[PDB]
Amino acid sequence: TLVSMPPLPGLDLKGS
Amino acid sequence: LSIHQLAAQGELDQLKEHLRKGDNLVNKPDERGFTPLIWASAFGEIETVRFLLEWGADPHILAKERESALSLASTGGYTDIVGLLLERDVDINIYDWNGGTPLLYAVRGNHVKCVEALLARGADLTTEADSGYTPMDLAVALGYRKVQQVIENHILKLFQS
């Protein structure tokens, strides 16, 4: 088990 | 598992064993510059975060693209970890090249309690994302009405006794 670092989210409205 | 993965997964007994010598290994960056503390923060592993901070892990370290423990905790809405990091005098307005700040990330994830905590500690509401949106702009555009209310209540206090 090797977990994936989450991304920092985009700060626009893309994908809501 | 690497110390970074032990931290991420809250394998604290194993992490303590790896750190036994107590040198600068606690702050060891991985290939992307992440410290064990950044990993634990990003995964909401509160007990591991507490242990690392008390051991003396440096909470200010930035990874290769300026990611911080504070912004990754805020992204995940981990209010208690955010509070722990702020008690260690991290920069509450830390900017990274993805374009954001802890407050922007907490708003973007609809993390009401984390937004509340960041504002209570004086995070700057005027700071725009690189996209041009302020935290209030995001909350309004996304229809995150409780986040909007929390921001509004904070703004009230900025201008009234």
Swiss-Prot record, chain A:
Question: Motif location (PxLPxI/L motif)?
Answer: 6-11
- Post-translation changes: Phosphorylated.
Where it sits in the cell: the answer is:
Nucleus
Summary of the tissues where the protein is detected: Ubiquitous.
Q: What pathology does the entry list?
A: MHC class II deficiency 3: An autosomal recessive disorder characterized by immunodeficiency and recurrent bacterial, viral, fungal and parasitic infections from birth, usually affecting the respiratory and gastrointestinal tract. Most patients die in infancy or early childhood.
Function per UniProt: Activates transcription from class II MHC promoters. Recognizes X-boxes. Mediates cooperative binding between RFX and NF-Y. RFX binds the X1 box of MHC-II promoters.
UniProt lists the family membership as follows:
Belongs to the RFX family.
Cite the domain annotation text.
The N-terminus is required for dimer formation, association with RFXANK and RFXAP, assembly of the RFX complex, and for binding of this complex to its X box target site in the MHC-II promoter. The C-terminus mediates cooperative binding between the RFX complex and NF-Y.
Q: How does it assemble?
A: Homodimer. The RFX heterotetrameric complex consists of 2 molecules of RFX5 and one each of RFXAP and RFX-B/RFXANK; with each subunit representing a separate complementation group. Interacts (via PxLPxI/L motif) with RFXANK (via ankyrin repeats); the interaction is direct. RFX forms cooperative DNA binding complexes with X2BP and CBF/NF-Y. RFX associates with CIITA to form an active transcriptional complex.
Protein name per Swiss-Prot or TrEMBL: DNA-binding protein RFX5
Q: Which organism is it from?
A: Homo sapiens
Stretch of the intact protein here: 168 to 183 of 616
From Swiss-Prot, chain B:
Gene Ontology biological process terms in this record: positive regulation of MHC class II biosynthetic process; positive regulation of transcription by RNA polymerase II; Ras protein signal transduction
**Repeat positions for ANK:** 1-27, 32-61, 65-94, 98-127, 131-160
Q: What is this protein called?
A: DNA-binding protein RFXANK
Any single GO CC term annotated in Swiss-Prot or TrEMBL for this entry: nucleus
Tissue specificity field: Ubiquitous.
Query: Where does the protein end up?
Result: Cytoplasm; Nucleus
Give the keywords, sorted.
Activator, ANK repeat, Cytoplasm, Disease variant, DNA-binding, Nucleus, Repeat, SCID, Transcription, Transcription regulation
What disorder does this protein's entry note?
MHC class II deficiency 2: An autosomal recessive disorder characterized by immunodeficiency and recurrent bacterial, viral, fungal and parasitic infections in early infancy. Additional manifestations include failure to thrive, chronic diarrhea, and autoimmune features and allergies that may be present in some patients. Death often occurs in infancy or early childhood.
Complete-protein stretch covered: 92 to 252 of 260
| Summary of subunit composition and partner proteins | Forms homodimers. The RFX heterotetrameric complex consists of 2 molecules of RFX5 and one each of RFXAP and RFX-B/RFXANK; with each subunit representing a separate complementation group. Interacts (via ankyrin repeats) with RFX5 (via PxLPxI/L motif); the interaction is direct. RFX forms cooperative DNA binding complexes with X2BP and CBF/NF-Y. RFX associates with CIITA to form an active transcriptional complex. Interacts with RAF1. Interacts (via ankyrin repeats) with RFX7 (via PxLPxI/L motif).
PTM comment, free text:
Phosphorylated by RAF1.
What's noted about domains in the record? Interacts with RAF1 via its C-terminal ankyrin repeat domain. The same domain also mediates its homodimerization. The third ankyrin repeat is required for association with the two other RFX subunits; RFX5 and RFXAP. The three central ANK repeats mediate binding to the PxLPxI/L motif of RFX5.
Q: Which domain of life is it from?
A: Eukaryota
Q: What does this protein do?
A: Activates transcription from class II MHC promoters. Activation requires the activity of the MHC class II transactivator/CIITA. May regulate other genes in the cell. RFX binds the X1 box of MHC-II promoters. May also potentiate the activation of RAF1. Isoform 2 is not involved in the positive regulation of MHC class II genes.
GO MF annotation terms: DNA binding; histone deacetylase binding
Variant or mutagenesis effect after changing residue 30 to V? Loss of expression
